[PDB]
Amino acid sequence: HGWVTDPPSRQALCASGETSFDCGQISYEPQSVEAPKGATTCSGGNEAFAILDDNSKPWPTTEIASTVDLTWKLTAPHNTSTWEYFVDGQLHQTFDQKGQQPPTSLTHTLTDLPTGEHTILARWNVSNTNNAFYNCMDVVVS
Ligand SMILES: [O-][O-]
Ligand SMILES: [Cu+2]
């Protein structure tokens, strides 16, 4: 269990009261967006958190540079295979944790992000279950 706090993920914005709409249950447990491996959606297909896939909502965006430090908060630091970062659904960078336990505060540096409005999907793959955690971040790169 864990989520991306900076730049804030969709679930982080719900939990921080930064959205102008009610997100429902996700606002109380941003760490819990768990679903089977292999998805490329913001909820991972976890039906309890389908609001995270709704692009019609006025999701806030964060202004960032083309190289950015991204920070996770993990409440339960499961042994991890990879952290995968997608930009608009296409794989951009992978970090290999080698099946080890990560720190509960973890920062990764993404580079060469395209300019303009994009959605980054961070997929955290757990090495000893069939689940991943899914975090979308809406950003404007300049
Ligand atoms: O706890 O996954
Ligand atoms: Cu967990």
Question: What residues form DSSP beta bridges with 122?
Answer: 85, 135
Distances (CA, A) of 64 to 14, 43, 69, 70: 20, 23, 10, 10
- Count of structural domains, the chain: 1
Atom of ligand 1 nearest to the CA of 133: 2
Give the rounded distance of the alpha carbon of 20 from its chain centre: 20
Distance in angstroms (rounded) separating the CA atoms of residues 44 and 117: 21
Contacts of 65 by beta carbon, 8 Å cutoff, 6+ apart: 113, 141, 142
The residue behind tokens 């609001």 is 51
Atom of ligand 1 nearest to the CA of 126: 2
- For residue 124, the tally of other CB atoms under 10 A from its CB is 27
Q: Look up the domain containing 29 and give its range.
A: 1-142
For this entry, resolution in Å reads: 1.1
Task: Ligand 1: list residues with CB < 6 Å.
Answer: 1, 34, 76, 78
Report which bound ligand comes closest to the CA of 130. Answer: 1
**118 is an annotated ligand-binding site residue:** no
Distances (CA, A) of 22 to 26, 32, 76, 131, 133: 10, 17, 26, 27, 22
